[PDB]
Amino acid sequence: MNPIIYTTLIMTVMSGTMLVMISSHWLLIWIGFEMNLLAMIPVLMKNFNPRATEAATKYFLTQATASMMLMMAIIINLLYSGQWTITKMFNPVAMTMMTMALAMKLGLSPFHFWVPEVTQGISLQAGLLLLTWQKLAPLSVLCQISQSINPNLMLTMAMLSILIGGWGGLNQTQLRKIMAYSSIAHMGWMTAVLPYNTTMTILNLLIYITMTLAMFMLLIHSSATTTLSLSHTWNKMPVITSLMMVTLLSMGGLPPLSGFMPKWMIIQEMTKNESIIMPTLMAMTALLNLYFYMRLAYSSSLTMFPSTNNMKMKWQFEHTKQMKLLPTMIVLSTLVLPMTPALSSLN
Amino acid sequence: LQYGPLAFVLGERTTRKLTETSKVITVDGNICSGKGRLAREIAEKLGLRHFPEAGIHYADSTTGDGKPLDVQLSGNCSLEKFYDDPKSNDGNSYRLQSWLYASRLLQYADALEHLLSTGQGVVLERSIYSDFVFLEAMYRQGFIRKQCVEHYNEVKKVTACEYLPPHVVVYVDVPVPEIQSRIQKKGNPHEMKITAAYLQDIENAYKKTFLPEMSEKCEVLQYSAREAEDAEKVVEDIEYLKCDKGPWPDQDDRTFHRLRMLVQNKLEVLNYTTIPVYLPEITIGAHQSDRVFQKFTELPGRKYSPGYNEDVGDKWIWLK
Amino acid sequence: PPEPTIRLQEDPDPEDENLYEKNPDSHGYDKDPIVDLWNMRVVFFFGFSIVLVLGSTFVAYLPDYRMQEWARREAERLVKYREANGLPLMESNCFDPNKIQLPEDED
Amino acid sequence: ARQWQPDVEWAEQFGGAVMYPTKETAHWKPPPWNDVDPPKNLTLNFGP
Amino acid sequence: SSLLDLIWLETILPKTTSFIQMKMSIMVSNQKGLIKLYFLSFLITIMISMTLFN
Amino acid sequence: MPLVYMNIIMAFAIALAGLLMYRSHLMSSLLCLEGMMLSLFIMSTLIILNTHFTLANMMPIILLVFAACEAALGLSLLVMVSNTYGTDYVQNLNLLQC
Amino acid sequence: PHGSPDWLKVGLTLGTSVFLWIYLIKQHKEDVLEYKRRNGLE
Amino acid sequence: MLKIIIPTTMLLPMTWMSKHNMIWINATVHSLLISLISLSLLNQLGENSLNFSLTFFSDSLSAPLLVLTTWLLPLMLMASQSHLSKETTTRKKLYITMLILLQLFLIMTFTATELILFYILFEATLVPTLIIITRWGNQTERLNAGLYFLFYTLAGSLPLLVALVYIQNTTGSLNFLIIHYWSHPLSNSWSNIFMWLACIMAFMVKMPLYGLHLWLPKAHVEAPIAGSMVLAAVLLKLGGYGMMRITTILNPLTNYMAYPFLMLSMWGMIMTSSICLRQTDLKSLIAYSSVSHMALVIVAIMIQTPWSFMGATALMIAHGLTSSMLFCLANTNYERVHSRTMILARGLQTLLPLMATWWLVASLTNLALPPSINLIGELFIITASFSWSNITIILMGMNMMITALYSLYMLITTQRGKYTHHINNIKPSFTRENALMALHILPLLLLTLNPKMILGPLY
Ligand SMILES: CCCCCCCCCCCCCCCCC[C@@H](O)O[C@H](CO[C@H](O)CCCCCCCCCCCCCCC)COP(=O)(O)OCC[N+](C)(C)C
Ligand SMILES: CCCCCCCCCCCCCCCCC[C@@H](O)O[C@H](CO[C@H](O)CCCCCCCCCCCCCCC)COP(=O)(O)OCC[N+](C)(C)C
Ligand SMILES: CCCCCCCCCCCCCCCCC[C@@H](O)O[C@H](CO[C@H](O)CCCCCCCCCCCCCCC)COP(=O)(O)OCC[N+](C)(C)C
Ligand SMILES: CCCCCCCC/C=C\CCCCCCCC(=O)O[C@H](COC(=O)CCCCCCC/C=C/CCCCCCCC)COP(=O)(O)OCCN
Ligand SMILES: Nc1ncnc2c1ncn2[C@@H]1O[C@H](COP(=O)(O)OP(=O)(O)O)[C@@H](O)[C@H]1O
């Protein structure tokens, strides 16, 4: 499309998220969600083809249903107590409705089914935006009403999300599906700590966004969308594969990498609330995510796969365009464990 | 300021450069026909840039130094051994075909980049389109397998689905006996081993498939040997015709912007030339790939980016 | 079957290179004789000469921070004192009962 | 005398649509190399 | 060597875990991509959530 | 809470279930979405009028407009899908799968 | 490709670094004096 | 304690700024100097500890392990110099970087005054060794080996983390000094039973305990020589060190929660020993011998007596040195024959007499021949077990039998008999290999003269 129109659409998506973040009236939060959805659809279809159109229609259907139940929750809340301010819900029925709407907006299980297919349909830049920016508004709304949520439902969806992401990622050869299932698991981890500490939620969100940005930018740099296409990357740009392996090790939660910081703190916080079984189950389950990250690392950087002859010509060209902040993202997603006590900044 | 979205935002529009002289012409003729002499003449008369036919080392001439590299680093194939032993066990035939298609694709990208960035039209020899005839010929002589042609079709589909076909296609028709005589008087020992059937197959391919499919979407000037030396008439025919059936009139400034971003960034052009389908003729094992890539890096000006090689003579490294 | 029985384009497996043939008295450290000789010399000097000998003699003469002879002398003077004064050598209680407050049972 | 590196047969494991093929999913196919699927004027008769 | 070390110790901890995770991954990831089934499950989950939790 | 609110909420739930059924015909999906929106508009208007909350008389109109815009978007998507397949059946959208 | 050191970019980069370092030193001095004045150390 | 940490970190820039043909020399020489610095730590005191700072502290249990860790790196560099000759300079620097990082994490783990820092470094060590195994390994099974070595470990260690943070929420600290001084008994409860299991299982997996040892033969056989040396010499001792540290909060529960483990060891050390009698691979045989020795160390730690702890410290040091030497000998044979099958190359005493005497001394130390420190640890553990129960001697006694047996079997199969006729590429032993052998074995016979240096804090 036109660069001016694309810039306007991206700015409108940003403004929808910000309108959600800065408003105190439920109608304006709903309007921000509407504006965000309205401007997000063309971005998913920037590269026109049947797959992107199918992904966009699936995404529109899910987000429109979520917005309708969001509106329904707001009206029910209004009926019981005549308040428009975003605070703890005055009605139990309204709260559950609100919780499932935001679960669909985030992609938490069992409302996860759309994430892998939409991520597969769209390009890599659209996938980066969808898996990083499109989680800020629902999570901020959840943070604002965390004192209202029923812990049973919320923790049930969190544990289900972790299990589903771990299991579904094991069956994937496509990289975008792997990213989608990883995002589902990380949403589960983030939402498992809302009832107890929203600062831990924000810390996990920031760490995850950093790692996801690094991973998507590295996948774009070596323009690969499958396992075998990435297996050729060592034959042209081995530094990219080494950085990708270190980032994958970090994303699996291996100390002393950055990705160990959230789970550790989250586990620690839950232990403060006399919750022992759930964090244990969550860690043993995150081992599955680590397994398919390790499989990707084996296929990419720890072994050298057969190449092709036409690759020789690719040896004679450089990347014309660069991702700025890619080195910063890699460094921040691998080596910020010693800076852990900085979370008191209420990040 | 390299061309990008910001340049298009400020001033850069390439529809203001097109002056009806762009008219990308491509010339196709059977081996040993004087298409090259004719193509050069057409480019001389019309003011266009001539692109000599891509070889095994075409890409070597656009990057770093223009000198070709070793065969083991650039192409890993030879036409001479193809002529000598077309049915060899090391798969030189299909590796040669694939490398030449990649070179042709790369050349077309450079020609499109020039035409879009400056407005001056270009003239080419055998392009990505009509590259397949050597393919079909190699299959009809039994030189290559069916898996090779299916892989070629996959790569050609995925790559050629993104570029604009040429306006004018010029075919010089020379019968197989005449080109056989031209080869015999050429004196090249390897070219003399081209069998009659192979030449016929190449001729057959243009007539059976290339000429008819092209005629449906562009304008064709099929010429015989005698009618090809007098280039004034050829230029007259080129200028008289008006292209109104191709996709080119439908293109506009937004499509031009996308295409101009595609033609530069040669890594994106060559992205699908290395799809991970494993044909024994073109797939290379890890050890050989590793040592050959190491050797390529050891080349004088190839360890770093072009402006960061002290050995060739780059200065002020610590401030670039 | 026109297949070449060649699954891909691969280098043959290289054969082991003998370090002795190109260079007798080779020391097995490197294939460049000067670097190899210096590697041997540094290994032997810093391992056998410096760490192994000087470190061993350093460990042998480490001052008695564990206080072996101190405990011997203290026990010697206690035994001398309790023998001279008729004390019953070692006492069965580690702490004197005068300041241990047991809980009264009243059962 | 050489370190083992993956060959074509080892790489075929990761080339399918999914890991662990099943009887039901055996008919699935990997997506096109570019994410584009093949696509696979009315006449009016104004009579008297 | 064979009965315990190479067979049964393998069968108990690692092989069983691998088998179960493989089966669960197959069950989870075998979705035809038809939104009919997806939103039927969403209705099921929505109905269950309101009644079961409170 | 009187029975008029109960009936409007029941209508909303029926429309939501109908959307989640997906017999076929994505147009029916959009119809179910807009039936949900109509029920929402009616019940919000009833609540706002009943409690005499004057400044919130703004809210229903706003809701309507935004939802209608969504319908436009949805319609566009439906149209494009049909141009690829010739019809708007739900089962045509199975290229992307989990 | 073929490019000389862009002295404009180099100048801006070094100037930004120097400005940041100088501002940091001044800021630290100001915090030290302000803390001392607030807590009555010096 | 920074006087050792900082030079080890400085090893990295020196390696990365070295000339392409001077990396091995600089690494070996500097690492050796660092090892010399480690000797100062040994001058331990009979009272509490060398509490250097709030972060690090040294002890007469930690000091021998630190010295062994610093000493192992030069030997690993010497062993790796050979098979990495045809390797690019950047990748050789990467290999040395992996070794240096591994050493850095290991040195830090021992000072590690608090349990969370110890856990973090204890798990940080898992990354460089996994990269070493799955990158610079020859066979195709290495990938599986890596996976096993990973998940087993994490399967035991993630619960530990939970337990650890739980303790800090109840007691308020995880500093080892405060834990030791403010220790309280563990009541007989189900929750306490599971906290005991969470505390123990992480270290019990890395010993490895019999039944949980499947990862070890793989990860040792398909690893390169440096990886095998570091795995057997030091990485197996992390579990023992952690058990010795953490069992101060597990009393009096260990008085009966140790029964399933003791059995698994006392019988297990027999079973794995018998496995060594029928083995077609040298590396697998050495790995199973490691399993048996660590089973004995597990018994010692679970008994919890002063003699048990002294014997366990001595045995850990002795086993590290001996198993590293045995792996190095096996690799010297392998780099000539390229087979790693014990029956193939025979009669090597006739062709390599000095390798033959190195093999003999290594087998005699594995034999537990007095007065080697292997015997000192063996005997202290056996005496402590006899005091624990007079019947253990049978198992212990029979174990010694089998050990000697298979050890001499390994010496007779490979060194004695008749040379294999068709193998004609048995070149003379290099000075590098003889120097590696001497630098393994001389510290053992030097430590047998001053046993208090390696008998731990209960001496
Ligand atoms: C990799 C880790 C995450 C990335 C770190 C950030 C990198 C880029 C940041 C560049 C500057 C951003 C700072 C913004 C400038 C002004 C901030 C100010 O205006 O807002 C404050 C907010 O500032 C943030 O709180 C501080 C951001 C600092 C983030 C870093 C800490 C992350 C944890 C430690 C990881 C180690 C990272 C350190 C190495 C870079 C006031 O917040 P407040 O409106 O009143 O409360 C709303 C939030 N509530 C609801 C949770 C209470
Ligand atoms: C080849 C043919 C033979 C030729 C050689 C003939 C000569 C034979 C002599 C050699 C052995 C004969 C026995 C003689 C023994 C006398 C030496 C002994 O007495 O000294 C010991 C001293 O030895 C040291 O204590 C032990 C050496 C230190 C070992 C450390 C290893 C070196 C560092 C390498 C890295 C470490 C890796 C392993 C990690 C733990 C014990 O002495 P001790 O009575 O008690 O105190 C010393 C004197 N005081 C009282 C004043 C203090
Ligand atoms: C495969 C290689 C090795 C792997 C690891 C093996 C080691 C793990 C084994 C765990 C050690 C012991 C576990 C529990 C010990 C408690 C003592 C118990 O065994 O004795 C009786 C316990 O009674 C019964 O046994 C109840 C438990 C029966 C059901 C539990 C299953 C037992 C075997 C399962 C082992 C499975 C191992 C692998 C699991 C993943 C005493 O009865 P009672 O005096 O009244 O109650 C005392 C406990 N109180 C005071 C806290 C109440
Ligand atoms: C090598 C592979 C081994 C795999 C892992 C083996 C380790 C298993 C150890 C148990 C895991 C979880 C332990 C919890 C960590 C300690 C925390 C703790 O002790 O808190 C307990 C909590 O206790 C538990 O929650 C234990 C539940 C265990 C759930 C997971 C079961 C794991 C497997 C069970 C069967 C086998 C267990 C041992 C297997 C050994 C390895 C084979 C009590 O605290 P409170 O509840 O606050 O106080 C009581 C008053 N309310
Ligand atoms: N696609 C192709 N496949 C195989 N060989 C080709 C291909 N294209 C050109 N060639 C060979 O390259 C040589 C030069 O091309 P050509 O134009 O016919 O001769 P000339 O350069 O003398 O005019 C010829 O021998 C031709 O056969």
PDB file of N, CA and C in Angstrom, chain B residues 297-314:
ATOM      1  N   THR B 297      34.925 -16.684   1.866  1.00  0.00           N
ATOM      2  CA  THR B 297      35.192 -15.598   2.804  1.00  0.00           C
ATOM      3  C   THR B 297      36.647 -15.143   2.742  1.00  0.00           C
ATOM      4  N   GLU B 298      37.577 -16.061   2.484  1.00  0.00           N
ATOM      5  CA  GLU B 298      38.994 -15.723   2.424  1.00  0.00           C
ATOM      6  C   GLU B 298      39.363 -14.879   1.211  1.00  0.00           C
ATOM      7  N   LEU B 299      38.444 -14.689   0.266  1.00  0.00           N
ATOM      8  CA  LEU B 299      38.721 -13.881  -0.909  1.00  0.00           C
ATOM      9  C   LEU B 299      39.104 -12.465  -0.484  1.00  0.00           C
ATOM     10  N   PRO B 300      39.876 -11.744  -1.315  1.00  0.00           N
ATOM     11  CA  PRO B 300      40.424 -10.447  -0.887  1.00  0.00           C
ATOM     12  C   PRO B 300      39.402  -9.480  -0.308  1.00  0.00           C
ATOM     13  N   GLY B 301      38.379  -9.111  -1.069  1.00  0.00           N
ATOM     14  CA  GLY B 301      37.441  -8.123  -0.574  1.00  0.00           C
ATOM     15  C   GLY B 301      36.085  -8.685  -0.207  1.00  0.00           C
ATOM     16  N   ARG B 302      36.062  -9.868   0.408  1.00  0.00           N
ATOM     17  CA  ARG B 302      34.810 -10.558   0.672  1.00  0.00           C
ATOM     18  C   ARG B 302      34.593 -10.941   2.130  1.00  0.00           C
ATOM     19  N   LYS B 303      35.496 -10.578   3.040  1.00  0.00           N
ATOM     20  CA  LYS B 303      35.282 -10.921   4.442  1.00  0.00           C
ATOM     21  C   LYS B 303      34.246 -10.011   5.089  1.00  0.00           C
ATOM     22  N   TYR B 304      34.256  -8.729   4.751  1.00  0.00           N
ATOM     23  CA  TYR B 304      33.362  -7.760   5.364  1.00  0.00           C
ATOM     24  C   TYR B 304      32.488  -7.112   4.294  1.00  0.00           C
ATOM     25  N   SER B 305      31.692  -6.137   4.718  1.00  0.00           N
ATOM     26  CA  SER B 305      30.909  -5.355   3.787  1.00  0.00           C
ATOM     27  C   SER B 305      31.835  -4.492   2.933  1.00  0.00           C
ATOM     28  N   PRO B 306      31.378  -4.079   1.744  1.00  0.00           N
ATOM     29  CA  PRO B 306      32.307  -3.512   0.750  1.00  0.00           C
ATOM     30  C   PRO B 306      33.171  -2.369   1.251  1.00  0.00           C
ATOM     31  N   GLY B 307      32.653  -1.512   2.116  1.00  0.00           N
ATOM     32  CA  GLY B 307      33.446  -0.404   2.597  1.00  0.00           C
ATOM     33  C   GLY B 307      34.299  -0.684   3.815  1.00  0.00           C
ATOM     34  N   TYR B 308      34.501  -1.947   4.182  1.00  0.00           N
ATOM     35  CA  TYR B 308      35.168  -2.304   5.428  1.00  0.00           C
ATOM     36  C   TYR B 308      36.215  -3.386   5.207  1.00  0.00           C
ATOM     37  N   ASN B 309      36.955  -3.302   4.107  1.00  0.00           N
ATOM     38  CA  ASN B 309      38.003  -4.268   3.779  1.00  0.00           C
ATOM     39  C   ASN B 309      39.326  -3.517   3.661  1.00  0.00           C
ATOM     40  N   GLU B 310      40.178  -3.640   4.681  1.00  0.00           N
ATOM     41  CA  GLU B 310      41.461  -2.944   4.656  1.00  0.00           C
ATOM     42  C   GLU B 310      42.402  -3.519   3.609  1.00  0.00           C
ATOM     43  N   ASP B 311      42.290  -4.816   3.318  1.00  0.00           N
ATOM     44  CA  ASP B 311      43.230  -5.448   2.399  1.00  0.00           C
ATOM     45  C   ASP B 311      43.121  -4.865   0.996  1.00  0.00           C
ATOM     46  N   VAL B 312      41.899  -4.610   0.524  1.00  0.00           N
ATOM     47  CA  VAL B 312      41.745  -4.030  -0.807  1.00  0.00           C
ATOM     48  C   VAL B 312      42.082  -2.546  -0.783  1.00  0.00           C
ATOM     49  N   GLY B 313      42.039  -1.928   0.394  1.00  0.00           N
ATOM     50  CA  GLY B 313      42.455  -0.546   0.496  1.00  0.00           C
ATOM     51  C   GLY B 313      41.446   0.406   1.103  1.00  0.00           C
ATOM     52  N   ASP B 314      40.480  -0.111   1.857  1.00  0.00           N
ATOM     53  CA  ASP B 314      39.538   0.762   2.545  1.00  0.00           C
ATOM     54  C   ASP B 314      40.213   1.425   3.739  1.00  0.00           C
TER      55      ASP B 314
END
